[PDB]
Amino acid sequence: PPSIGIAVILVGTSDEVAIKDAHHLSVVPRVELVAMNETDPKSIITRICDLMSDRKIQGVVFADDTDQEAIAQILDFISAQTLTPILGIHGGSSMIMADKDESSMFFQFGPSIEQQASVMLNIMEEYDWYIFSIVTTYFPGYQDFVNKIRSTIENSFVGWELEEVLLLDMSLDDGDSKIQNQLKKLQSPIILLYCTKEEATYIFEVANSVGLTGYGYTWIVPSLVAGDTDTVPSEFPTGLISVSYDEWDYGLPARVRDGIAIITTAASDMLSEHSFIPEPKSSCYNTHEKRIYQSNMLNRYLINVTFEGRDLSFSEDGYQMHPKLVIILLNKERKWERVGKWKDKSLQMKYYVWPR
């Protein structure tokens, strides 16, 4: 059986040996571990383009150890421009990007925005926290977050009361104390926050100045705010709750395994029905002329892969279908602590009553 090239790109400390260890079809992967040091736009673009011009790369599996959600945005850009499958399986690369490009072949391990928002309301209903407000920035997704909440609420015979929705503009400086004045309008005991880790750092610092972090106020954030759970900004308030896919039961070795399998299975499935797979672009410099020769046809297979009898399928929107999510709680030692699973559209919490 013929070989397809798959680049596995690892940013930051990682055990390559344990990775190369976790790793029947019409086609057979030639895997290629590349390490990378930097995660700026140029470094990432140049690295992947150089790979694509040396070897014949059918697909890219990408993992990093940063909290940089921008990595996902860069990868989606690269994927759409070169029409190359990229899986962001860990780190900033997996931090949800809303509104991927029409031509994107970029898929991310982890929950959609809407699913996290659904989980967050389930947590609230469990502890009968029905009164709440929303804070977001303009970070892409924030509309999808607010809309998901609103339409769940609106269609429920439960006494939800959404009191305030704040939109915070952090593209401008805060020397007029705007964000402080907006935050001082919050009364609700539960506050849902959608933004980036770095944004939340600042927002929490301000909320604290105004007496909103302590007892009587519970903040709930999505995976990308907690980010890497071994990095905990000092401004994060004790008692913070988060939905998380940071890396609990689904280790990097296993993720890279499933990533390689998804790309390999998808290609095999296409070769089997059409007697070709798309040819690896040999240049980023040339993508403007060679464009009528390229498509995102591989997508339709990328999203319907079963491997080892594990359903690994993606949504069309490019996120994982049935992720097991871990609900975590920032405790007095300022360590993140497991306090819940979200499994089979079912929430299973540790505590019936919250200790302090």
Ligand X SMILES: *[C@@H]1O[C@H](CO)[C@@H](O)[C@H](O)[C@H]1NC(C)=O
Is 270 in a helix, a strand, or coil? helix
Q: Quick count: other Cβ atoms within 10 Å of Cβ 125?
A: 13
Q: Which of 22, 33, 45, 153 binds another protein (CB under 8 A)?
A: 45
Q: Could you say whether residue 96 binds Cl ion (CB under 5 A)?
A: yes
Tell me whether residue 37 or residue 346 sits nearer to ligand X (CB atom): 37
Residue 239 dihedral angles phi and psi, to the nearest 5°? 100, 0
304's contact among Cl ion, ligand X, another protein, none, with CB below 5 to 8 A by partner kind, is ligand X
Q: Is 90 assigned a ligand-binding role in the annotation?
A: yes
Q: How far is CA 220 from CA 15, 87, 225, in A?
A: 33, 27, 10
Tell me whether residue 139 or residue 307 sits nearer to ligand HYY (CB atom): 139
Footprint of ligand X (CB under 6 A): 37, 304
Within 8 A by CB and 6+ apart from 90, the residues are: 63, 64, 65, 109, 247, 252, 255
355's contact among ligand HYY, Cl ion, another protein, none, with CB below 5 to 8 A by partner kind, is none
Q: How near is the Cβ of 140 to another protein at its closest, in Å?
A: 5
Name which of 2, 50, 13, 18 is nearest 256 in CA terms.
18
Tokens of 60: 């890219």
Q: Which of 13, 17, 24, 37 binds Cl ion (CB under 5 A)?
A: 37
Tell me whether residue 16 or residue 279 sits nearer to ligand X (CB atom): 16
Q: Could you say whether residue 229 binds Cl ion (CB under 5 A)?
A: no
Of 69-77, 117-125, 279-287, 290-298, the segment contacting ligand HYY by CB under 6 A is 69-77
Name which of 220, 217, 308 is nearest 261 in CA terms.
308
Which residues are paired to 3 by β-bridges?
28
Of 8-16, 80-88, 126-134, 169-177, the segment contacting ligand HYY by CB under 6 A is 169-177
Say if residues 314 and 94 touch (Cβ distance below 8 Å): no
Tell me whether residue 314 or residue 342 sits nearer to ligand X (CB atom): 314
CA distance 222 to 194: 7
Q: Could you say whether residue 233 binds ligand HYY (CB under 6 A)?
A: no
130's contact among ligand X, ligand HYY, Cl ion, none, with CB below 5 to 8 A by partner kind, is none
Where in 268-327 is the site for another protein (CB under 8 A)? 284-288
Is 341 in a helix, a strand, or coil? strand
| Total of residues contacting another protein (CB under 8 A) | 34
Q: Could you say whether residue 101 binds Cl ion (CB under 5 A)?
A: yes
Q: How far is CA 151 from CA 116, 188, 239, 267, 315, in A?
A: 14, 20, 28, 38, 20
Q: Quick count: other Cβ atoms within 10 Å of Cβ 198?
A: 16
Which residues contact another protein by CB under 8 A?
38-43, 45-46, 49, 66, 68, 70, 73, 77-78, 81-82, 99, 138-140, 142-143, 169-173, 175, 284-288
Q: Which residues bind Cl ion (CB under 5 A)?
A: 36-38, 42, 77, 80, 95-96, 101, 223-224
Which residues fall in the annotated binding site for Zn(2+)?
A: 90, 247
